[PDB]
Design a protein around this ligand. Structure first.
Ligand SMILES: OC[C@H]1O[C@H](O)[C@H](O)[C@@H](O)[C@@H]1O
Ligand SMILES: OC[C@H]1O[C@H](O)[C@H](O)[C@@H](O)[C@@H]1O
Length: 397
């Protein structure tokens, strides 16, 4: 009956992590109210066993928890013996995240992997919540599951066209209807932008870094997984940009693009979600802002990859989430443009037309500025490469 929030962590990019690197990520996750990392890992990485051992040790040492996400883009159904041996190592580890007295285990893809032989070979109870693609098959799953994890974190109609938002709960409600008694782990992602030779698209997210958390308070799923802590290559990271991870080419659009301020939004929503509350509690005045580096129609000078699929559906907007103890007035300067809007107490998002140039934010109450400053990135009217990630920043009273 207790509710918990987890975050997807890419073990595949941390070959060179130390225990101290893991501890740093875990401390930041704890400060946000996250309960555990899903350690997404691959059979093909020679460093998987080493880094799982470091993560479980770090979690035990800093009062955090972890569980394994077997990434079945790499793991295979023929790996049952190795998966079993890993669960024999970790299901009863004090740092292993437990749900209802059983060790949580999950996947990326891997719908066809049968958990029966694993569960029946491990003495400690296991709670299997794999990533499943079809809500209806989740209803009659043959693989000995205890719940399902959805990857439908972004607007989609089920096909391969990119569709406009705003995000809806249509897929969440389909999973929940089919799961009945079983548990549902809902995905929470702030953004999506990827730009590789093998994957080059955006999803239409916009106000998603706030809106999705509001949906979580409405929906009250049994578990949440944040997509993601550190998948720089898909731009949905809410964790820090770690110096020790291995760059895959995503540094091009991520190294200068902090996302840490999105944790300011997540923190009160996580507390409210765990408490069963329908609205967050604001403890101090804060502001979180985000925006892309250029207007969407700018043509690049030299990108060997074309523009990402879907960009025409984006808006040229600056997004601002205010976290307010009392009503106030929000003023935004975006290039030569200036806007203002009265905002209620609570957590509210407003979008503003993007202008090229410097960005400025200010919140005033009773004719006095309570917070404000300059955006950390000037919006530009040209680019070498297409970057549809966002810069995120904050101001706190
Ligand atoms: O974790 C599996 C694989 O994930 C990603 O493709 C990484 O770029 C690669 O280095 C890793 O082997
Ligand atoms: O829907 C987003 C997902 O699309 C594809 O399945 C990609 O393989 C995966 O990496 C991405 O997260």
């Amino acid at each position: 009956s207790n509710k918990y929030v987890t975050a997807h962590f890419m073990v595949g990019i941390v070959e060179n992590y130390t225990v101290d690197d893991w501890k740093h990520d875990m401390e930041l996750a704890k400060e946000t109210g996250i309960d555990a990392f899903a350690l997404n890992c691959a059979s093909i990485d020679s460093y998987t066993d080493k880094q799982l051992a470091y993560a479980y040790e770090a979690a035990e040492e800093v009062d955090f928890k972890v569980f394994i996400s077997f990434d079945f883009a790499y793991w295979s159904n023929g790996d049952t013996a190795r998966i079993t041996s890993i669960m024999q190592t970790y299901a009863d580890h004090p740092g292993q995240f437990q749900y209802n007295g059983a060790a949580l285990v999950s996947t990326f893809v891997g719908d066809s992997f049968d958990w029966g032989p694993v569960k029946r070979a491990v003495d400690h109870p296991i709670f299997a919540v794999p990533n499943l693609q079809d809500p209806n098959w989740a209803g009659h799953a043959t693989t000995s599951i205890d719940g399902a994890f959805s990857w439908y974190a972004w607007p989609t109609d089920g096909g391969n066209s990119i569709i406009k938002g705003p995000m809806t709960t249509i897929w969440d409600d389909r999973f929940r209807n089919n799961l009945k008694d079983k548990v549902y782990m809902a995905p929470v992602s702030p953004w999506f932008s990827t730009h590789f030779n093998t994957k080059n698209w955006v999803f239409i997210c916009e106000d998603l870094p706030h809106l999705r958390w509001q949906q979580m308070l409405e929906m009250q799923p049994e578990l949440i997984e944040i997509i993601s802590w550190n998948d720089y290559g898909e731009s949905h990271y809410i964790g820090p940009y770690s110096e020790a991870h291995s760059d895959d080419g995503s540094a091009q659009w991520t190294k200068d693009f902090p996302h840490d301020a999105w944790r300011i939004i997540a923190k009160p929503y996580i507390a409210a979600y765990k408490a069963g509350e329908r609205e967050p509690t604001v403890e101090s005045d804060q502001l979180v802002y985000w925006y892309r580096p250029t207007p969407k129609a700018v043509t690049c000078s030299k990108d060997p990859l074309g523009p990402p699929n879907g960009i025409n559906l984006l808006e040229d907007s600056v997004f601002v989430t205010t976290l307010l103890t009392e009503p106030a007035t929000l003023t935004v300067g975006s290039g030569s443009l200036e806007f203002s809007v009265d905002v209620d107490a609570g957590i509210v998002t407003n979008s503003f037309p993007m202008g090229v140039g410097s960005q400025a934010f200010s919140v005033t109450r009773d004719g006095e500025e309570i917070l404000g400053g300059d955006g950390g990135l000037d919006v530009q009217d040209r680019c070498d490469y297409y970057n549809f990630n966002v810069y995120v920043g904050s101001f706190s009273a």
